[PDB]
């Protein structure tokens, strides 16, 4: 859209102003039901050829069902919390006597339903598969005949298509040990997810956002095994809610900033330690330092608020003017001077120091820019690759407008050698 950033030379940092928050600040459970019947002994005589196939399929199905039965830089500042908390609570609710029977009875003929539980929670129940009807109307009458004589090769083949799911679901639940992330398409098909989205009690904007980005809401969801009593496989999906929608917010990148002293090892320098995302939620700001948790998709970010900071709203003031008596503006100081570079949304920041070649080149005319000293900026639509020392970075090539403001080397304000070389967590 209008992705723009303003590189401030005061402290080497890129602020990619202009995005949309779409934060995730809510959990919504949903119960997905696979119905299945309990077969007795096979009661089929004669090996034949197709009878062997049916026997293998039924044996593997029973093995799957019995296996599933036998189943039942600011990172330190973040708090911790349980992610599977709503799913386990709903499962513990389902363990109560006379509860899954409500799920089965109420969901008799429709596919989707809304029911009540012991504690009064209204969750969405959805039948995903209908193995009961197929196994009690199309296979057992054929197999239970005396002198089993399967005359239809289709019998087995379509059976495969109606067994695969109940097989491979179990497969995943045997590998991930109960909970799976992300929810695979076997656990929830795309059309199934789309149908389930438009039944949640949420506003129209939330439905539009979460229906148009099914891949991301698939990546951020959880799954958990529940009771299997009364021959009804039930598992809880944890499709995330989306409280705040369409509030402008930004991403901040930092880089080292050191003096070019001739004497090696005597160039003290500080770097801002705030890399990550800042999103304007309510009258405060929500801060995500973990850049790996935040997901990006076409100007819209999707980030879990469970790992965040409730930072005060007066944080853009520190971003604009570093030296203000209104925010401590956390930093970290060291005497290590090693060439490095970062790749922001619309350009490349270079912080190479000392005897180390620095270059920026493109595939058209080759070498275009050479960096002398200090951290510098190259816009994305001027260059294609950047290189520091002996390593090569590919700058992002997505359209946008970038403006490179002029600043001053703030570390020259400080005395040549009074700084400590000890802190990973300090402030101005």
């Amino acid at each position: 859209q209008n992705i723009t950033e303003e590189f401030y030379q005061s402290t080497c940092s890129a602020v990619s102003k202009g995005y949309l928050s779409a934060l995730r600040t809510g959990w919504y459970t949903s119960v997905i039901t696979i119905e299945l019947s309990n077969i007795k002994e096979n009661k089929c005589n004669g090996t034949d050829a197709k009878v062997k196939l049916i026997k293998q399929e039924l044996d593997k199905y029973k093995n799957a069902v019995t296996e599933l039965q036998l189943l039942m830089f600011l990172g330190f500042l973040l708090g911790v919390g349980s992610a599977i908390a709503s799913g386990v609570a709903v499962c513990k609710v389902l363990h109560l006597e006379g509860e899954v029977n409500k799920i089965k009875s109420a969901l008799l003929s429709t596919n989707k339903a809304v029911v009540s539980l012991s504690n009064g929670v209204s969750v969405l129940t959805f039948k995903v598969l209908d193995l009961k009807n197929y196994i009690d109307k199309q296979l057992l009458p054929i197999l239970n005949k005396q002198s089993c004589s399967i005359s239809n090769i289709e019998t087995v083949i379509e059976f495969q298509q109606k067994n695969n799911r109940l097989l491979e679901i179990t497969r995943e639940f045997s590998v991930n040990a109960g909970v799976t992330t992300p929810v695979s398409t076997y656990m929830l098909t795309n059309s199934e997810l789309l149908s389930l989205i438009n039944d949640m009690p949420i506003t129209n904007d939330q439905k539009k956002l979460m229906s148009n980005n099914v891949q991301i809401v698939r990546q951020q969801s959880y799954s958990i095994m529940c009771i299997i009593k009364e021959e009804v496989l039930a598992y809880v999906v944890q499709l995330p809610l989306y409280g705040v929608i369409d509030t402008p917010c930004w991403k901040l990148h930092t880089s080292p900033l050191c003096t070019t002293n001739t004497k090696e090892g005597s160039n003290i320098c500080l770097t801002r330690t705030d890399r990550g995302w800042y999103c304007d939620n309510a009258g405060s700001v929500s801060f995500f330092p973990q850049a790996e948790t935040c997901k990006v998709q076409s100007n819209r970010v999707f980030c879990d608020t469970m790992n965040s900071l409730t930072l005060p709203s007066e944080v853009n003031l520190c971003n604009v003017d570093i030296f203000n008596p209104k925010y401590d503006c956390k930093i970290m100081t060291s005497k290590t001077d090693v060439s490095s570079s970062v790749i922001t949304s619309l350009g490349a920041i270079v912080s190479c120091y000392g005897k180390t070649k620095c270059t920026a080149s493109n595939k058209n005319r080759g070498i275009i820019k050479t960096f002398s000293n200090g951290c510098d900026y190259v816009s994305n639509k001027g260059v294609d690759t950047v290189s520091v020392g002996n390593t090569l970075y590919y700058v992002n090539k997505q359209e946008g407008k970038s403006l490179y403001v002029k600043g001053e080397p703030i570390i020259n304000f400080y005395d040549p050698l009074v700084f400590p070389s000890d802190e990973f967590d300090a402030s101005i």
Partner: antibody, heavy 126, light 110 residues
Framework: QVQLVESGGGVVQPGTSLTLSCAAS????????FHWVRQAPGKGLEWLAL????????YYADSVKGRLTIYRDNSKNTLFLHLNSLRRDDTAIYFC???????????????????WGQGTTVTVSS | QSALTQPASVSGSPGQSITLSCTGT?????????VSWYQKYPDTAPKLVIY???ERPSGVSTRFSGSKSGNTASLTISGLQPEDEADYYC??????????FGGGTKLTVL
């Protein structure tokens, strides 16, 4: 001591949907399954309906499907019948039946007759 | 109403044998091996005497014998008794998810 006790019946005018009730005692009820048969004077037995554990799955007869509903309430250990649009040919005695061994829905495992009941007589007249 | 054909009545002297039968089709009685024979005295509830062609319940005398052949189920007795005057019914599973009863036969002794 396995025994079934019946309730309801009598003379019913054409139409006049009548709810019929069975009962059981002396054995586990939520495990075994039940079904319902009827017999008319001068004729034989005629399959009427079948219910497995809970209201999970219900099987109906070809000549009766649609006109009849059968369900169960395990809290009161009772079995209920609702038939509407009663015709002139429903004059008969209704019998409860107990069948099945485990938690199964396939009707092939559900044809056993371990016990029977006493039946209720229902007749229509004008 | 579809049913299963059975003889109207059979009569035999005490201490003899009978060959009662009921005929169906390829998808009922003749298959699925679920043939059942039920007793009925007048004014009394029916009882299960034979199930799954030849298997027998508890408390039944060994005089009965059930079998199936082609599309016909057959019941045979030995040593007829005066209390055998009753009604016989054959019940078996039909392919279209139903349990089909017979027409009823009357057994009398002379």
């Amino acid at each position: 001591q396995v025994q079934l006790v019946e309730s309801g019946g009598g003379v019913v005018q054409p139409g006049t949907s009548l709810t019929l009730s069975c009962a059981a005692s002396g054995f586990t009820f939520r495990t075994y399954a039940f079904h319902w048969v009827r017999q008319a004077p001068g004729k034989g037995l005629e399959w009427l309906a079948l219910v497995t554990y809970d209201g999970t799955t219900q099987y109906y007869a070809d000549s009766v499907k649609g006109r009849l509903t059968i369900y169960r309430d395990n809290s009161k250990n009772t079995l209920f019948l609702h038939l509407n649009s009663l015709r002139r040919d429903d004059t008969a005695i209704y019998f409860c039946a107990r069948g099945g061994e485990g938690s199964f829905s396939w009707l092939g495992y559900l044809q056993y007759m371990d016990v029977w009941g006493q039946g209720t007589t229902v007749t229509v007249s004008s | 109403q579809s049913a299963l054909t059975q003889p109207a009545s059979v009569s035999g002297s005490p201490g003899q044998s009978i060959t009662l039968s009921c005929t169906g089709t390829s998808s009922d009685i003749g298959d699925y091996d679920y043939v059942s024979w039920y007793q009925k005295y007048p004014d009394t509830a029916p009882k299960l005497v034979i199930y799954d062609v030849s298997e027998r319940p508890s408390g039944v005398s060994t005089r009965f014998s059930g079998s199936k052949s082609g599309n016909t189920a057959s019941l045979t007795i030995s040593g007829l008794q005066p209390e055998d005057e009753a009604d016989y019914y054959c019940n078996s599973y039909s392919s279209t998810n139903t349990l089909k009863f017979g027409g009823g036969t009357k057994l009398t002794v002379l």
